[PDB]
Amino acid sequence: MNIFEMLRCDEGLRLKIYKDTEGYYTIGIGHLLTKSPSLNAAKSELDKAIGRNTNGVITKDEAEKLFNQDVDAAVRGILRNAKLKPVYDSLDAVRRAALINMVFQMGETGVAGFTNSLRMLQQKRWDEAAVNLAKSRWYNQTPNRAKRVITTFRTGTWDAYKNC
């Protein structure tokens, strides 16, 4: 298991524009297009991202390319973030994957706001961090995915990703 297989497991793969859990226009592997309510705005962002007239539908390769860019960007955002970087550097390889997962889902800003949780991860207080992470809108809105990520931080293994 690796970050790619992990995220592919959590987000799924859709070749036509869809609405995410929050009601936002998305395509491929969790690639947010726009928070705007206009499907037209969404098709426009899509065409711009892909470099061609897609008519709202993309191929597997196109989906994968967007996915590769998004993972890369998430990693680079963590490395450029003064709050995130030190945590990431302190973690083992599995747990790093967990943090990357959160950033991909909720953005750099969102994650950096988890002040107390970040501090506990840095101190390697796994059980305490797992409990604090769960006290969030994140966990309440997408509890199955959050539990999977939280278990990853708690155990430092890929057990939560067995049935993928």
UniProtKB/Swiss-Prot annotation:
Changing residue 26 to H: Facilitates transglycosylation more effectively than hydrolysis; covalently bound substrate. It catalyses: Hydrolysis of (1->4)-beta-linkages between N-acetylmuramic acid and N-acetyl-D-glucosamine residues in a peptidoglycan and between N-acetyl-D-glucosamine residues in chitodextrins. Induction: Expressed late in the viral replication. Changing residue 117 to I: 500-fold decrease in enzymatic activity. The active site is at 11 (proton donor/acceptor), 20 (proton donor/acceptor). Changing residue 117 to F: 10-fold decrease in enzymatic activity. Changing residue 117 to V: 50-fold decrease in enzymatic activity. It is an enzyme of class 3 (hydrolase). Gene3D superfamilies: 1.10.530.40. GO terms for biological process: cell wall macromolecule catabolic process; defense response to bacterium; peptidoglycan catabolic process; viral release from host cell by cytolysis. InterPro entries: Endolysin_T4_type, Glyco_hydro_24, Lysozyme-like_dom_sf, Lysozyme_dom_sf, Phage_lysozyme-like, T4-type_lysozyme. Its EC number is 3.2.1.17. It is found in: Host cytoplasm. GO terms for cellular component: host cell cytoplasm. Substrate binds at residues 32, 104, 117, 132. Keywords: Antimicrobial, Bacteriolytic enzyme, Cytolysis, Glycosidase, Host cell lysis by virus, Host cytoplasm, Hydrolase, Viral release from host cell. GO terms for molecular function: lysozyme activity. HAMAP family: ENDOLYSIN_T4. Belongs to the glycosyl hydrolase 24 family. Endolysin with lysozyme activity that degrades host peptidoglycans and participates with the holin and spanin proteins in the sequential events which lead to the programmed host cell lysis releasing the mature viral particles. Once the holin has permeabilized the host cell membrane, the endolysin can reach the periplasm and break down the peptidoglycan layer. This is Endolysin. It comes from Enterobacteria phage T4.
